[PDB]
Ligand code: CLA
Ligand code: CLA
Ligand code: CLA
Ligand code: CLA
């Protein structure tokens with residue numbers, strides 16, 4: 019009858035409850051992603067972000083980079099991934115240096131964002147090195 | 156309602172009696188399907204009774220056509236596959252008779268007062284007037300109809316395994 | 325009240341026996357049309373014009389197939405008048421185009437007289453005032469008989485002129501020798 | 513009992529259709545598992561029919577445009593690395609539907625969570641829910657009858673109308 | 676024939692045919708609220724709304740004419 | 751789950767007289783001449799206005815009873831088939847004389863049996879003229895069904911005023927109903943009789959000539 023209602027029963031907030039924003043598929047997927055899952059240390063949050071993101075990011079670098087058709091094609095795609103991860107970790111470092119000023123495990127604080135970007139850098143270089151193993155042998 | 160008496164013991168099950176014989180329990184699981192079940196039992200019963208007479212009578216006498224003879228078809232068991240133009244005319248006129256019962260099948264519950272299996276078909280008037288032996292006349296149709304349901308499976312496989320005449324070997 | 329011609333049907337309400345050939349024969353209810361510039365006035369003017377055109381067409385065929393074409397048009401020589409038209413068009417096409425534009429001026433004036441005669445009430449349908457001998461001056465019972473005789477001969481000639489077109493365009497012979505062909509074919 | 517608050521699927525010509533009495537006496541918990549089974553069988557079989565009918569005559573491109581004219585032999589030449597992918601990929605959704613199931617206002621086939629917007633009290637939403645389960649029930653038996661005529665009778669196409 | 680047959684779709688003085696207003700008000704679903712209700716009153720009271728549709732169609736048509744005249748040359 | 755249409759079609763108190771296990775149809779009252787309550791598929795109880803085939807329901811609000819439409823269609827099927835079975839046999843010489851028209855298009859050397867007369871005269875053109883002549887009568891007599899559907903006419907079904915010899919001029923209503931029953935009974939038999947002749951000659955066994963077996 020009506021699959022679009024105002025969000026939070028509030029007709030004047032700038033948001034709608036559609037089956038993209040408020041479906042049970044969306045509510046159950048988003049609450050279990052490591053950005054929003056309840057029982058997670060901020061080191062473990064970023065570690066799951068890094069393991070997801072460092073794994074696929076070796077993909078475009080090995081198959082499309084300048085050393086495509088070489089015998090060092092995989093280690094060139096791995097080194098380009100680590101260089102991209104260090105750029106992204108620098109972006110996380112300068113974000114937390116400006117946004118947060120001086121309860122733990124709450125992600126949007128200064129002490130926890132240093133845990134969050136540390137876990138991202140370990141997980142992203144770890145899963146880029148893991149895909150280095152699975153693509154070679 | 157009328158078919159649940161006995162004593163008539165169940166063979167290969169010496170403890171069970173046939174009085175209120177319902178081990179799966181279709182009467183309590185779905186009681187609204189019970190007038191559909193009685194209509195289906197009588198239609199299975201009346202078709203199997205003519206199937207028993209129809210399986211042993213063409214063993215001796217044949218209809219005077221010369222595509223139904225013993226030289227044409229000695230066995231009754233392959234007459235279904237040997238006379239296809241004879242089967243469509245049985246299937247066609249039964250299909251007409253069955254299509255005129257769809258508004259009776261569509262009102263088998265509490266729609267109108269037709270009892271299941273009662274097609275108001277008594278031209279010779281053999282239904283008794285007193286009610287207490289009408290039920291045993293109904294019980295005689297069910298017991299003879301249930302027996303012919305068992306028997307036509309034994310008649311056909313008794314002739315499919317051992318190709319022989321009437322009794323069997 | 326029932327129709328005279330179709331006594332199982334009710335009488336059509338706009339037909340009341342005032343017109344000449346009125347016996348209530350409108351089963352499709354076409355006299356009740358009042359929308360796309362068409363009403364009972366337009367259909368009666370169309371009936372009367374179809375009557376008079378077809379009446380002249382029948383004797384216009386029977387004049388040439390009996391006594392030949394007119395002098396100046398002796399180039400026809402065909403009893404089939406659907407084919408004899410194309411021999412007059414082949415040789416003297418200007419007189420046919422003279423008549424067809426003279427009809428065009430007459431018919432466009434008659435189309436104005438029909439729609440102005442319908443909006444006003446001073447013109448009967450199919451009436452042009454062409455009574456030069458003056459049959460309409462006296463004996464209104466004998467004048468209504470002439471109004472009915474025009475309609476009765478005109479409704480008959482409508483079938484005859486449509487037939488002589490169609491059995492001239494399909495047999496290529498002519499009307500009177502289509503008639504002799506049918507007489508010898510179906511004699512018993 | 514359970515059928516009084518679960519009126520989806522109760523459509524003409526039948527009423528509540530249960531000759532064998534499998535719903536009689538059973539709890540609402542196991543009856544909700546039967547609706548979860550009926551909808552999941554009906555939704556896989558509706559997608560199985562559209563998977564069968566496209567690959568039988570039409571648009572079997574690609575897997576390099578080869579491998580497929582008949583749907584049952586086409587389940588052989590593809591690698592099993594592509595099979596357990598499909599097995600793990602559906603099991604990711606079967607895992608996510610468990611999280612949708614472990615929620616208070618969950619209805620036994622509502623993976624989308626349409627009970628947030630409409631309930632079974634408006635007739636147009638019940639009528640469209642019945643259209644899914646009727647076409648699911650029809651595509652269940654019509655997938656089995658067309659699997660079995662390609663397993664045994666050899667033909668994978670339209671044995672009723674033409675080809 | 677396809678154009679003459681299509682010119683007998685809409686209701687006029689003889690009862691048969693479709694009302695465009697009743698076509699539009701019937702086409703509404705659970706995502707779109709009232710649906711196409713009120714679009715008949717827009718397109719019979721706003722000349723600008725009709726020109727919005729007719730220019731977007733005649734411009735799209737002229738673009739279709741360009742592709743179809745080079746590829747299937749008609750003259 | 752909705753109220754079933756079964757209840758609005760049957761009487762549910764009375765049984766059909768011809769088929770005793772079925773309930774009586776709501777429109778079959780025994781007033782019509784051939785009425786013995788025979789409607790096992792309940793086609794008289796169909797709530798559609800069947801005069802929509804002639805003039806659509808969108809033209810104006812009208813409605814003919816289904817039993818009026820069915821009897822008008824039964825009587826037209828009766829009277830066509832009585833003439834057609836007689837016309838098939840008379841042009842085949844079943845009554846002694848092979849009745850043919852005086853034209854040689856219709857002679858027995860041109861058209862040997864009545865089996866071959868349809869396709870021979872669609873090609874010649876006699877059947878196209880019959881379709882004009884029949885269609886003229888059907889446009890002029892079929893429009894009374896619209897008049898009945900509007901509630902304007904009290905005409906009975908199949909009840910033109912065609913009694914040229916006046917067999918029913920001063921007769922009572924039970925002898926008119928007897929005479930209307932003999933029309934219906936001979937018509938229903940001739941409909942099955944035309945079904946026999948048109949099918950038995952169409953088999954590959956043959957016998958296009960009388961007695962068509
Ligand atoms: C924007 C258009 C475009 C594209 C598609 C490419 C593509 C490419 N460039 Mg080129 N290039 C471009 C513009 C582009 N270039 C421009 C504007 C310049 C400056 C003039 C260059 C200068 C340049 C140089 C000098 C070189 C290239 C090279 C390359 C190749 C590898 C690059 C790489 O490894 O990135 C890595 C890619 C990523 C890290 C991410 C890709 C984006 C991902 C896939 C998006 C995924 C989103 C996902 C689908 C959505 C979510 C899904 C789900 C979760 C919901 C690749 C073919 C290299 C080469 O050797 O060519 C063969 C190379 O040496 N480029
Ligand atoms: C198939 C035809 C048929 C039908 C529709 C019925 C229906 C009925 N019977 Mg009857 N019955 C039958 C055949 C049938 N029977 C036969 C052949 C016999 C002799 C063995 C009996 C002996 C019998 C007795 C003694 C009694 C009944 C009773 C009943 C009524 C009880 C309700 C019920 O349980 O439904 C039954 C539902 C079905 C029959 C359909 C289910 C079919 C199953 C699923 C298939 C398997 C059947 C069988 C085991 C096949 C074995 C072959 C296999 C191993 C290869 C119901 C009207 C009772 C009664 O009349 O109370 C008023 C009663 O007391 N029946
Ligand atoms: C439907 C009427 C009609 C038509 C279309 C024709 C057509 C023809 N006739 Mg025929 N004819 C007709 C009636 C008709 N005739 C009548 C009623 C007679 C007397 C019985 C004849 C006797 C006749 C003879 C003897 C011959 C023809 C010939 C011809 C052909 C050449 C003549 C020509 O083109 O003149 C050109 C047209 C004109 C000179 C003017 C036409 C009349 C004008 C438009 C006035 C009409 C007034 C109207 C009748 C009433 C008033 C209307 C309004 C005020 C209400 C031509 C095909 C000749 C032929 O070639 O045969 C093969 C020939 O020899 N006709
Ligand atoms: C105006 C009326 C009319 C008339 C008289 C004719 C006449 C004819 N047309 Mg034409 N035709 C007409 C209008 C007419 N048509 C129309 C409106 C069209 C369509 C536009 C056609 C289209 C057309 C075509 C395409 C053809 C004809 C043909 C014919 C001829 C065929 C013979 C026939 O069937 O006669 C009609 C037959 C009768 C009326 C039967 C007579 C019935 C008798 C009198 C009844 C008496 C019986 C009695 C009571 C019983 C007792 C006696 C018993 C004891 C012995 C005939 C000359 C054909 C032709 O040209 O042949 C060469 C032909 O091919 N017509």
Ligand code: CLA
Nearest residue numbers: 830833834837840841849850851856861867876877880883
């Ligand atoms: C269902 C009725 C019916 C039909 C469809 C036919 C059809 C045919 N007849 Mg047959 N015929 C019939 C009954 C019928 N007949 C009857 C009852 C007799 C008297 C015994 C005949 C005597 C007969 C003979 C002698 C011959 C035919 C022939 C033919 C064939 C060609 C006739 C033709 O086209 O000329 C056109 C016919 C006419 C114009 C006659 C008028 C028809 C009217 C307009 C029909 C409607 C009037 C109706 C009787 C009453 C109206 C009721 C209404 C007002 C409510 C054609 C296949 C011929 C043939 O080819 O044989 C092989 C042939 O020689 N018929």
Ligand SMILES: CC(=O)O[C@H]1CC(C)(C)C(=C=C/C(C)=C/C=C/C(C)=C/C=C/C=C(C)/C=C/C=C(/C)C(=O)C[C@@]23O[C@]2(C)C[C@@H](O)CC3(C)C)[C@](C)(O)C1
Nearest residue numbers: 165166167168171178232235236304305306307308309311
């Ligand atoms: C408490 C409990 O459980 O105890 C049990 C114990 C007990 C006693 C065992 C019971 C039982 C189970 C029973 C009685 C099961 C019996 C089942 C039965 C009697 C099943 C045959 C049906 C007839 C047929 C199929 C006829 C076909 C007819 C024909 C003509 C054909 O064969 C087809 C054919 O001509 C064609 C068309 C095509 C050609 O190819 C050729 C052939 C010839 C093939 C109870 C009562 O349930 C209770």
Ligand code: KC1
Nearest residue numbers: 650652653654655656657658659660661664665667671672
């Ligand atoms: C509801 C959808 C449905 C349709 C529309 C349908 C139709 C046909 N079936 Mg199928 N059928 C099922 C469902 C359907 N069947 C199911 C659920 C099963 C159990 C798995 C099943 C089993 C078999 C077997 C063993 C055979 C079979 C056949 C036919 C053939 C009969 C025409 C005839 O000959 O009268 C027509 C096309 C025979 C055949 O010849 O297949 C080409 C055959 O041997 N069926």
Ligand code: KC1
Nearest residue numbers: 561564565566568569570658668669670671672673674675
């Ligand atoms: C009742 C619903 C219905 C379904 C569910 C269905 C399904 C399929 N049809 Mg069938 N079909 C009709 C109805 C249905 N078809 C109708 C009304 C007609 C006209 C009388 C018709 C005719 C043909 C012809 C000529 C062909 C055909 C095929 C297929 C095949 C592949 C999809 C496709 O391309 O249509 C799938 C199984 C082709 C084929 O069998 O390839 C091996 C083929 O050549 N169909």
Ligand SMILES: CC1=C(/C=C/C(C)=C/C=C/C(C)=C/C=C/C=C(C)/C=C/C=C(C)/C=C/C2=C(C)CCCC2(C)C)C(C)(C)CCC1
Nearest residue numbers: 069070071073074140141143144145146147148149601604
């Ligand atoms: C499901 C789905 C989807 C999605 C997809 C995607 C997006 C995917 C992704 C995925 C991914 C993205 C994956 C990942 C993976 C990863 C991993 C698996 C990793 C691991 C790692 C490791 C294991 C490492 C380790 C280490 C370290 C840490 C350090 C030391 C060394 C080493 C190496 C040992 C879509 C949308 C289509 C829809 C449908 C369904």
